[model samples]
Target: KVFGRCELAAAMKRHGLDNYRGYSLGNWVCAAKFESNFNTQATNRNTDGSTDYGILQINSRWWCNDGRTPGSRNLCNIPCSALLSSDITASVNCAKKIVSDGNGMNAWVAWRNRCKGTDVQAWIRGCRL
Candidate 1:
């Protein structure tokens, strides 16, 4: 879809992610960079028979499609393919659901290991927000 850090920041803020899911703009920006480099089509196959999909790299085990696995929780009740779109509405909604489900940003391991305690204000630096 779109490129550039500022572009992504604008979209995130436009989507009101600045306070959604109890995460700051920096938190979402940092996690997106680390998780998928802001590529909406990004996908990662995990070692646990699950795949992560979309910008936030949400896992199929709980968020989206079951993929090869049957009976997936699919808590978000969305198709995994939906996460790959240029419009992040579905992805953002699913992510919000994930956070509301009590995982917060920890559902994304990258967020836990990388963004949790880091000073990521630079993610929004010069974004004109």
Candidate 2:
């Protein structure tokens, strides 16, 4: 977080990401802001990884809602892969709660399974969780 513009650019490059043209980064930042103030904590909403939400803003909508499946669309919230898991792993954890309950967004369920906290750039990688 103590890096300059160019350094941040390099960091973004290292994260395998391009640049924020529109609200993409902003949206993710919104989620990040929702989770932790750019802190890194393997937090848990539950006890096991089941609750570890993380800073990138991950949740459990992935498994809890099977929209594509028969009789499960409205509640499932399709476009399952829109939430990118890499970004979730590479975020700063402000409240460790992200590691706990996660972003709590029904859309981020995929990240629940994607983020194990092992990856160094948990939220920066941008891997389409």
Best prediction by lDDT = 1
On TM-score, the leading prediction is: 1
Query: Model 2, range 56-117, lDDT digits (tens) per residue?
Result: 43434333232333333222232333332334323322212332343343344433344323
TM-score of 2: 0.32
For each candidate in turn, the TM-score is 0.91, 0.32
Q: Please write out the lDDT profile of model 1 over residues 51-107, one tens digit for every residue.
A: 988898888887787568567788888889999999999988888777787667887
Provide the lowest-lDDT 10-residue window in model 2: 88-97
Q: Where does model 2 exceed 4 Å of error?
A: 1-23, 47-49, 57-129
The list of candidate 1 runs beyond 4 A from truth reads none
* Cα error of candidate 2 at position 6, Å: 11
